[PDB]
Structure formats: C-alpha cells, structure tokens
Amino acid sequence: SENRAQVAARQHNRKIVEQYMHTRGEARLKRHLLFTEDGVGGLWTTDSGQPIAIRGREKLGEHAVWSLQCFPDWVWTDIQIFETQDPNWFWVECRGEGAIVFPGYPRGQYRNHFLHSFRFENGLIKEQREFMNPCEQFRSLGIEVPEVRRDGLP
Amino acid sequence: ENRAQVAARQHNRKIVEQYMHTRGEARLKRHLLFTEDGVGGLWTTDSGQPIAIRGREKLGEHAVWSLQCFPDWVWTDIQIFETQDPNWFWVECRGEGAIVFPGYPRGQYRNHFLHSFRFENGLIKEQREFMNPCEQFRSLGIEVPEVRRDGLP
Numbered sequence: 106s107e108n109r110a111q112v113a114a115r116q117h118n119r120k121i122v123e124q125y126m127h128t129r130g131e132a133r134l135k136r137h138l139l140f141t142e143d144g145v146g147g148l149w150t151t152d153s154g155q156p157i158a159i160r161g162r163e164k165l166g167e168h169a170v171w172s173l174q175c176f177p178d179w180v181w182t183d184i185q186i187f188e189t190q191d192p193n194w195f196w197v198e199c200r201g202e203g204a205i206v207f208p209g210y211p212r213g214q215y216r217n218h219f220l221h222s223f224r225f226e227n228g229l230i231k232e233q234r235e236f237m238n239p240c241e242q243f244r245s246l247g248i249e250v251p252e253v254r255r256d257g258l259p
Numbered sequence: 260e261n262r263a264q265v266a267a268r269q270h271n272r273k274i275v276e277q278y279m280h281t282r283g284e285a286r287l288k289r290h291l292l293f294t295e296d297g298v299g300g301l302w303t304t305d306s307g308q309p310i311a312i313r314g315r316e317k318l319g320e321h322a323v324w325s326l327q328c329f330p331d332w333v334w335t336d337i338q339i340f341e342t343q344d345p346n347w348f349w350v351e352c353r354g355e356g357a358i359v360f361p362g363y364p365r366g367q368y369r370n371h372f373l374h375s376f377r378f379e380n381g382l383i384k385e386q387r388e389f390m391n392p393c394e395q396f397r398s399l400g401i402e403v404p405e406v407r408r409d410g411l412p
C-alpha cells in the first residue's frame with residue numbers, strides 16, 4: 106500500500122509542521138525534539154549570502170537558548186501550510202514578529218514575511234530552512250539599507 | 260469534486276512548467292499565461308514593498324524592459340511543488356543572467372528564488388517571486404551592510 110503509506114506520512118508530518126509553527130515561549134527550548142538527531146535548521150537568506158545552518162539536534166537546542174534571549178516574544182502569524190506531492194516535503198508561508206534584542210544593537214521591533222521549507226525523515230524534521238528579505242532585519246537593527254536607483258526604470 | 264480538482268492541478272502544472280522554461284524572445288508572450296487582471300512581480304526588494312505588475316497589458320510591457328535589463332535570463336534547478344490547493348503551486352529554483360540596470364555597471368546576477376503561482380480558470384491570477392536582495396546588490400556593485408556577529412554563538 107504505497108498510497109496508504111504516503112497518506113499516513115503526510116498527515117503525521119503536517120501535525121509536526123503545525124506544532125513547529127505554533128511553538129512559542131518556553132516551549133521553544135524543546136522545539137529541537139521535532140528534528141532527527143542529525144537534523145538541520147536555520148536561515149537561508151542572510152547579509153553574507155551564505156546560510157546560517159544549525160546542524161544537529163544538540164546545536165538546535167543550544168540555538169533555542171540564544172533565540173529566547175534575542176527574540177523573547179517571537180511569534181509566527183498568518184500561517185499557511187502547503188502539503189506537496191512529496192509526503193515528506195512541506196512549505197509554509199507566514200509572517201513573524203517580535204522584539205529584537207541583538208547583541209550590540211539597540212533594542213527594537215522586527216517584523217517580516219517568511220517562507221519555510223520542511224523536509225521529513227521517519228516522522229521528524231530532517232531539514233528546516235527559512236527564507237526572508239534581510240533588508241527588513243537591517244531596518245529593525247537600525248542598519249541603513251542600500252537604495253537601488255530606479256530613475257532609469259519604468 | 261475530486262475529478263475537477265485533479266483536472267485543474269494537471270493543467271495548472273503545465274502552465275507553471277511553461278512559465279519557468281520561458282526564455283529569450285518567448286518572454287514577450289509570457290503575459291498570455293495570466294488572466295486579464297493577473298498580477299506578477301517581485302515581493303522582496305530594498306524598499307520593503309513589492310514591485311507588483313498589475314494586469315496582462317502591464318505584464319506584457321514589463322517583458323520589454325526585462326529583455327533589455329536581463330537579456331539572457333534563465334531559471335535553473337527548477338523544482339515544482341503542487342499543493343493541496345489545485346490552484347496554488349510553489350517553485351524553488353535558481354536564476355542567472357547578465358544584469359544591465361540603468362546607470363549601473365553591467366554585471367552578472369545569480370540568485371536563489373521561490374515563486375508562488377495562484378490560478379483562476381486555467382491561467383495565472385497571481386505570480387510572486389521571493390529572493391535575497393543582497394545578491395542583487397552585489398551584482399550591481401552596491402555595498403551590502405554586514406550584521407555584526409561577534410556577540411552571537
């Protein structure tokens with residue numbers, strides 16, 4: 106029953122995506138338990154052009170300690186979960202917001218639009234990736250955003 | 260109900276495939292894949308507001324400018340994702356080509372992209388693309404600010 110197995114995987118994996126996206130507050134300290142032991146999470150859109158990949162369940166748990174300090178009230182909002190033809194691959198469109206308390210920058214408020222990719226193995230997240238426009242994070246940190254000159258464009 | 264959803268998804272997938280493969284002079288007719296009131300454009304920009312091109316006529320005009328400023332643009336590494344909504348698709352891909360922006364040195368632009376396609380009655384109602392604008396800054400010779408990471412693990 107290939108189809109039955111795929112349907113079961115997709116329904117379970119959707120519940121894990123829902124739980125990830127709704128993880129807030131102190132529960133963030135245990136979000137890494139939604140990953141495989143060698144699972145990877147992180148931010149694929151950064152200033153430098155290289156992803157910030159947090160590799161393995163142990164490092165993901167450490168990242169959560171940092172995130173609770175630097176993003177103390179972070180929430181995902183406007184959550185739309187997309188199943189796909191691959192029962193082990195989901196996409197999520199959402200927004201996120203909260204205070205930003207980044208080391209060495211003034212405290213501020215950060216709001217952005219996000220896309221997330223979730224790939225699963227044996228019922229847990231093998232790879233989570235998030236994609237956003239870093240210019241909005243620059244603005245939240247008081248960093249000047251470059252302005253493309255548009256005079257020559259329609 | 261299921262038969263109508265399956266029919267829609269299979270047809271719409273072919274339109275996404277056609278859109279993603281469109282290059283060269285065929286770009287001048289890509290707007291014909293949209294509804295008359297369809298919208299396309301870039302949702303991730305320096306200013307923080309989307310550049311939305313509204314209506315099939317304006318989309319056709321944009322293609323003229325695109326062939327000037329991105330004369331050889333190709334989408335590569337195309338992965339199409341169907342969803343539970345037969346009228347909504349996502350695409351993960353890369354793109355590459357010369358960038359010839361007015362008042363900037365000619366450059367080469369490469370980036371990773373996500374696209375969203377929503378359909379109505381067999382045609383694209385809304386196309387949106389999402390990327391990291393910092394790579395487009397680099398292709399234009401624009402300095403990218405650097406977030407200080409010393410205080411981070």
Ligand SMILES: CC(C)CNc1ccccc1C(=O)c1c(-c2ccc(O)cc2)sc2cc(O)ccc12
Nearest residue numbers: 147148151152157172176179239242406408411412
């Ligand atoms: C709740 C979310 C808004 C948290 N966000 C992140 C999530 C995952 C990875 C990195 C970040 C992040 O915020 C950035 C850096 C960072 C590096 C090391 C580290 O241990 C912690 C954070 S460096 C950098 C540069 C940018 O241009 C944008 C973001 C980040």
Ligand SMILES: CC(C)CNc1ccccc1C(=O)c1c(-c2ccc(O)cc2)sc2cc(O)ccc12
Nearest residue numbers: 253255258259300301304305310324329332392395
């Ligand atoms: C093949 C693709 C790489 C084409 N790309 C675009 C697609 C749709 C919309 C805008 C762009 C674009 O490239 C930007 C601007 C632009 C504005 C008006 C116009 O008629 C033509 C282009 S302004 C700006 C600022 C940025 O920071 C990044 C991109 C753009």
